[PDB]
């Protein structure tokens, strides 16, 4: 019942919103996971690993360049916008809204959200493999050698870019190879980020889970802690529930703006 949810919403002083891939799929943004989630011959599992990057950094950079380039035409959706405007409106009333996102597309930022924790990183940040520096980067193309590369067709030829001409670190002394600042399969989530997330979840008095489920990851890491404080959890996702907290079934860009208005 939306009315019962809205009664909690009206009273909540600290809302934590966790968002997963559903909220980014609705902006037209490929995940690369599942049936037809292919880029050339590969799926995301194959490419988003340090082993892929070590063995074929040009191929991995072609893949990330394609993804960066495709973001230009993909736009935040009504769910992202509702979330951002809710944060602004409630902030003026002294009420806090924070986003904990699995998504690396920066769409929440483009929507206007300020308090965002990107637990898997961002397509538009780099990390230097040598000095460790993390830097924002929205350049199209990220480096000249990648211009016009990254085609997703199976029979595309590899660019096979010499490593020296992949994106390099611009601290004059360093010049290290840059990688995407995205958490890859087999890597740890940042401890500092998780500590900040734990503090927000512990202080929150209403938690929303959008475009994913409480029962799987990453929600499963924190949602039980919230529930066990007696705090309501509201899921917005296209997933079904049997005859059995709150669940609003459907696309989040339809459900969420009504819930959050």
């Amino acid at each position: 019942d939306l009315t019962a949810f809205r009664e909690h919403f009206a009273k909540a002083k600290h809302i934590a919103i966790i968002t997963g891939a559903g909220v980014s799929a609705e902006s037209g943004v490929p995940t690369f996971r599942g049936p037809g989630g292919f880029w050339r011959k590969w799926q995301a599992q194959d490419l988003a690993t340090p082993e892929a990057f070590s063995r074929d950094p040009s191929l991995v950079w072609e893949f990330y360049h394609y993804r960066r380039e495709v973001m230009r035409s993909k736009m935040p959706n009504p769910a992202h916008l509702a979330i951002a405007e809710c944060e602004a409106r409630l902030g003026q009333q002294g009420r806090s809204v924070v986003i904990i996102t699995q998504n690396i597309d920066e769409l929440h930022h483009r929507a206007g959200s300020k308090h965002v924790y990107e637990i898997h990183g961002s397509l538009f940040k780099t990390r230097c493999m040598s000095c460790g520096e993390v830097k924002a980067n929205h350049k199209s193309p990220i480096c000249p050698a990648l211009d016009g590369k990254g085609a997703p067709d199976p029979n595309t030829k590899e660019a096979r870019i010499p490593v020296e001409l992949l994106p390099r670190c611009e601290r004059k002394s360093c010049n290290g190879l840059l990688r995407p600042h995205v958490v890859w399969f087999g890597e740890t989530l940042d401890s500092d980020i998780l500590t900040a997330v734990e503090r927000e979840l512990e202080k929150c008095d209403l938690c929303l889970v959008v475009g994913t489920s409480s029962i799987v990851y990453p929600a499963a890491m924190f949602a039980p802690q919230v529930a066990s404080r007696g705090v309501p959890v509201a899921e917005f996702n296209m997933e079904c529930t049997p005859a059995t907290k709150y669940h609003f079934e459907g696309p989040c860009g339809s459900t969420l703006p009504p819930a959050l208005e």
């Binding site: 740890t188 989530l189 940042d190």
Partner: peptide, 8 residues
């Protein structure tokens, strides 16, 4: 430190 997706 936490393993992205619990390693699954």
């Amino acid at each position: 430190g936490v393993l992205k997706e619990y390693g699954v």
